[PDB]
Amino acid sequence: KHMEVLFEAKVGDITLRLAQGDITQYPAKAIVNAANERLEHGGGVAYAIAKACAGDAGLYTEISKKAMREQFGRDCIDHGEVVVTPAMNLEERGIKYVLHTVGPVCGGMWSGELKEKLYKAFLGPLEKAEEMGVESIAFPAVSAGIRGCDLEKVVETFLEAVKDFKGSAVKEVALVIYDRKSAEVALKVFERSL
Ligand SMILES: Nc1ncnc2c1ncn2[C@@H]1O[C@H](COP(=O)(O)OP(=O)(O)OC[C@H]2O[C@H](O)[C@H](O)[C@@H]2O)[C@@H](O)[C@H]1O
């Protein structure tokens, strides 16, 4: 899997991990996608997940849009709303579901309102995984890429959502960072917050 675990701690009944690698290789029953509002997986982690699941990113975009329409009766999601799709080709590595979430557009800015939207984008998939009886879930750094939220602020917000979460089914939560320099930043956040 070419995955490195950098930090592990108990946060309630949840075992929380910080890992460095590709989220499409992480051993979790559900992986979270940092999607856009329309689930058009043309770039970033959304493209990576879409290409890994369906073999073609455009194909997974069609499957994701159909799932959004059936679950919400709309062609877009808001912060906190979560679309569930089958992980298809990723089922061979233990990943059964993709939980699509949408974070805010920071563009290098930070505020209480941007924090609330991101907090909802992290808590929503935890609550959806809980509702489904999913025991393990992996997250990317939602809004830290194209949406331009400061990585340190993204990791602090992710930790708030994990700490506030209440559940009986979710036992393992992981934050998966692709870049090694970015993983080091996330590590320092975990160390002073836990
Ligand atoms: N395979 C990977 N595994 C783990 N993390 C990854 C991977 N590839 C990238 N990342 C990291 O994943 C993090 C999130 O970066 P982004 O995927 O851009 O997500 P967003 O929430 O900012 O933008 C969402 C969409 O909205 C926009 O309008 C675009 O349409 C976007 O597709 C970064 O730190 C990446 O380095």
Numbering used by the authors: -1 to 192
Reported in the publication:
In addition, macro domains can recognize the terminal ADPr unit and bind to monomeric ADPr (MAR) and its derivatives, including ADP-ribose-1″-phosphate, O-acyl-ADP-ribose, and the terminal ADP-ribose of PAR, as well as protein-conjugated MAR or PAR (MARylated or PARylated proteins). Here, we increase the affinity of the Af1521 macro domain for ADPr by 1000-fold (KD from ~3 μM to ~3 nM) using random mutagenesis and in vitro ribosome display selection using an ADP-ribosylated histone peptide. The crystal structure of the engineered Af1521 (eAf1521) macro domain provides an explanation for the increased affinity.
Sequencing revealed that this eAf1521 variant contains nine point mutations. To this end, we solved the crystal structure of eAf1521 in a complex with ADPr at 1.82 Å resolution. The overall structure of the eAf1521 macro domain was virtually identical to WT Af1521. Nevertheless, two notable features could explain the improved affinity of eAf1521 for ADP-ribosylated targets. First, the orientation of the proximal ribose moiety of eAf1521-bound ADPr was rotated such that the oxygen at the C-1″, which serves as the anchor point for the amino acid acceptor side chain, resided closer to the macro domain surface. This change was facilitated by the K35E and Y145R amino acid substitutions. The R145 side chain forms a salt bridge with the E35 carboxylate, which provides a rigid boundary for proximal ribose binding, while allowing electrostatic interaction between the Arg Nε atom and the C-4′ (ring-forming) oxygen. In the WT Af1521 structure, the proximal ribose site is delineated by the Y145 side chain, which is situated between the ribose carbon ring on one face and the I102 side chain on the other. The electrostatic interaction between R145 of eAf1521 and the bound proximal ribose also changes the rotamer of the I144 side chain. The binding of eAf1521-I144G remained similar compared to eAf1521 indicating that I144 and the formation of the tunnel did not contribute to the increased binding we observed with eAf1521. Together, these results provide strong evidence that the two mutations K35E and Y145R and, as a consequence, the generated salt bridge solely contribute to the increased binding affinity of eAf1521.
